[PDB]
Amino acid sequence: GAGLADALTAPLDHKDKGLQSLTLDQSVRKNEKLKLAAQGAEKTYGNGDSLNTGKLKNDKVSRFDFIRQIEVDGKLITLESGEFQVYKQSHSALTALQTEQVQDSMVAKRQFRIGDIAGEHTSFDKLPKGGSATYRGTAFGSDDAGGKLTYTIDFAAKQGHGKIEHLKSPELNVELATAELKADEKSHAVILGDTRYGGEEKGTYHLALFGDRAQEIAGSATVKIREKVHEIGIAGKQL
């Protein structure tokens, strides 16, 4: 049961697997709305509203249709439409938007972006004080949810590194170069680094740690091919 209509319509209950919900912040700007539709249901979301991911399947991509709207002189118009993707783990989740149509100057333009990086963030002070952990999971980009993430954090050194493999576009199978594990503005544990291919920078990556002891990681990476930036969602779980 993909649980897509239920995510949009039905209250959470004790049988719904975590992650229970996420806040739509990066997925929709402060003055816009995101109308999500699937399986005959629809719900309109604004910035800061909760999406009940508990209804969705874990460790895979769930897909909805979206329409992104704004008001002009108090009346709604459509800016963009496409597919809204959610990749759900137990303490973390990612969203992404695959554009299919946009306002002209509606025309077909295809682009893909990561929206929210969400979950039960690990507090920096609650990180393991030593040892290392290795994580495995998924990398997904436009039209391709088959990639693999591998990532290792050395808690003693406060450094992480890893790689993306198996995406169909070969340039996307980048190194997630060594980067510092630091505290963000909420005292949550994060890693901001460079993507590299043959040691040359191709973009950046952002990983956040989730769970009471950093059981999960989730975030995004970018890889530029000619002038075109390809965004990739990356999420995994400790081995």
Side-chain angles (χ1 to χ4, degrees):
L4 311 178
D6 289 348
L8 301 172
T9 71
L12 292 163
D13 60 69
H14 75 268
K15 296 179 177 281
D16 295 322
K17 299 186 183 183
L19 183 72
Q20 295 305 316
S21 67
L22 63 82
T23 303
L24 295 162
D25 178 21
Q26 294 302 301
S27 293
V28 57
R29 291 195 186 275
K30 168 178 173 164
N31 73 345
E32 290 175 2
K33 294 295 201 178
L34 205 62
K35 301 201 299 187
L36 299 185
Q39 295 186 330
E42 190 162 38
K43 183 162 185 181
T44 301
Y45 298 86
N47 180 277
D49 289 346
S50 289
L51 173 62
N52 288 338
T53 53
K55 301 299 189 180
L56 305 177
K57 294 188 182 176
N58 286 63
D59 308 311
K60 72 188 297 185
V61 174
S62 290
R63 299 177 175 78
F64 302 79
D65 299 328
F66 80 91
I67 303 170
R68 178 154 61 111
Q69 302 201 306
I70 200 177
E71 288 183 352
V72 179
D73 298 344
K75 186 87 176 314
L76 287 159
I77 69 163
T78 293
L79 298 180
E80 183 189 39
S81 64
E83 182 179 272
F84 188 83
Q85 293 171 15
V86 178
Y87 188 86
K88 177 196 182 196
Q89 301 193 126
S90 294
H91 307 284
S92 56
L94 294 169
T95 74
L97 301 98
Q98 173 66 65
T99 308
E100 301 291 344
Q101 306 278 329
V102 302
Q103 284 256 0
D104 189 28
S105 297
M106 304 292 289
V107 298
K109 299 291 175 171
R110 301 192 79 241
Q111 68 161 63
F112 179 90
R113 64 188 180 270
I114 298 303
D116 284 288
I117 302 167
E120 303 164 349
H121 287 268
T122 310
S123 154
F124 187 83
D125 176 68
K126 297 290 269 181
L127 292 167
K129 207 196 300 161
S132 300
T134 299
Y135 300 78
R136 296 285 176 98
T138 289
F140 64 102
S142 181
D143 303 324
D144 185 0
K148 174 185 187 69
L149 173 69
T150 307
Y151 199 85
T152 303
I153 298 179
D154 181 339
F155 295 107
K158 297 285 188 304
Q159 296 191 318
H161 75 274
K163 56 186 184 296
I164 296 172
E165 293 174 293
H166 304 136
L167 290 171
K168 296 308 187 183
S169 172
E171 295 85 355
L172 302 183
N173 297 312
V174 289
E175 181 195 20
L176 306 175
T178 298
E180 186 189 353
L181 177 54
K182 68 180 178 61
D184 71 7
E185 281 294 307
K186 299 184 178 188
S187 203
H188 296 151
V190 302
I191 302 169
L192 309 176
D194 296 329
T195 59
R196 297 182 175 276
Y197 194 102
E200 309 182 355
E201 171 164 12
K202 303 292 154 168
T204 64
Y205 71 96
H206 174 127
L207 281 168
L209 282 59
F210 297 91
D212 68 281
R213 202 156 168 88
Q215 293 96 325
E216 289 178 354
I217 58 178
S220 61
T222 74
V223 179
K224 191 166 67 177
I225 303 175
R226 298 192 194 289
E227 304 180 329
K228 186 177 171 185
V229 173
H230 295 249
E231 301 200 10
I232 308 169
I234 47 174
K237 305 185 285 193
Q238 266 200 37
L239 296 180

